[PDB]
């Protein structure tokens, strides 16, 4: 399918390169040029009309690294906002508008710790699992029992309605990851760990085969986007799976903001209640 909306760097709403633009650059001499050079070429070839048989439209301004287009990812975004001359309604984007993006830098233990602590210490300089702080995720969504649309605290799979107490399956809608804590994690009960025929010594493949949490596979990594963050699975401890926001955004006050379709006003309005 044609990806119409892009950032000013010609990357899509998920933060990744479009196959059509990648091929367009490759057909010219330019797949290994810098992003700046590639964008100069695209601007010289009618910008959003460069593909000829379909149109693009710039919805976002992003600051990115200068890596070649084919190597651009959401982890190469430094900041994101609405494009100054885009006057339409912003579609869903991987990061909230008017935000700065932080990427977790991998750590190397001088002395590899075994088990879960070695896995988490490749992410955070923590001495114990309890130094990790669980995030508070929420989604603005309808409750099937009381029909109200409200902010339901959730994990990746289940949300709870604050009006009536009903658990609801998480569906697409405005999402936030709350404030970004130090040593940020999202903890969920691990089905593989709970199954006696599999159990806590399971593999990473075992985790994803039984979690029921869909991921995107790309260049050997698996991620799930939610609420302005890009999450990856780290490992399990005491039968809970730990995910970390390998990328997170900050709209102000350390808050991850709101992502989703038609959330521009919501995300702006949220900033106002973070301070006085
Ligand atoms: Zn195209
Ligand atoms: Zn309800
Ligand atoms: Zn597990």
Curated annotation (Swiss-Prot):
UniProt binding sites for Zn(2+) 2: 143, 146, 161, 164
Start and end residues of each stretch annotated as C2H2: 20-56
Protein's cellular compartments: Host cytoplasm; Host endosome
Top-level taxon in the UniProt lineage: Viruses
Ranges for region C4: 143-164
Chain residue ranges for the region called C2HC: 190-236
Residues that, per the record, bind Zn(2+) 3: 190, 193, 202, 236
Domain CoV Nsp2 N-terminal: 3-276
Effect after changing residue 126 to F: In strain: Isolate BJ04
Residues the entry annotates as binding Zn(2+) 1: 20, 51, 54, 56
Subunit structure: Interacts with host PHB and PHB2.
Role: May play a role in the modulation of host cell survival signaling pathway by interacting with host PHB and PHB2. Indeed, these two proteins play a role in maintaining the functional integrity of the mitochondria and protecting cells from various stresses.
This protein's name: Non-structural protein 2
Organism: Severe acute respiratory syndrome coronavirus (SARS-CoV)
Residues shown, of full length: 181 to 456 of 4382
């Amino acid at each position: 399918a044609v990806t119409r909306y892009v950032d000013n760097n010609f990357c899509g709403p998920d933060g990744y390169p479009l196959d059509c633009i990648k091929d367009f650059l490759a057909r010219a001499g330019k797949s290994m040029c810098t992003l700046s050079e590639q964008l100069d070429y695209i601007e010289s070839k009618r910008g959003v009309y460069c593909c000829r048989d379909h149109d693009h439209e710039i919805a976002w301004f992003t600051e990115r690294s200068d890596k070649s287009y084919e190597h651009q990812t959401p982890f190469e975004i430094k900041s994101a906002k609405k494009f100054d001359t885009f006057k339409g309604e912003c579609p869903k984007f991987v990061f909230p508008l008017n935000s700065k993006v932080k990427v977790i830098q991998p750590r190397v233990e001088k002395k590899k710790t075994e088990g879960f602590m070695g896995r988490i210490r490749s992410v955070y300089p923590v001495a114990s699992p309890q130094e990790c702080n669980n995030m508070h995720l929420s989604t603005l969504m309808k409750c099937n029992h009381c029909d109200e649309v409200s902010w339901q605290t959730c994990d990746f799979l289940k949300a709870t309605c604050e009006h009536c107490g009903t658990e609801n399956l998480v569906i697409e809608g405005p999402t936030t990851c709350g404030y970004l804590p130090t040593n940020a994690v999202v903890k969920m009960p691990c089905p593989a760990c709970q199954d006696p025929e599999i159990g806590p010594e399971h593999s990473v493949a075992d985790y994803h085969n039984h979690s029921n949490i869909e991921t995107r596979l790309r260049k050997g990594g698996r991620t799930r986007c939610f609420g302005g963050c890009v999450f990856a699975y780290v490992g399990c401890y005491n039968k809970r799976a730990y995910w970390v926001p390998r990328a997170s955004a900050d709209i102000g006050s350390g808050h991850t903001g709101i992502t989703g379709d038609n959330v521009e006003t919501l995300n702006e309005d949220l900033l106002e209640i973070l301070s006085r």
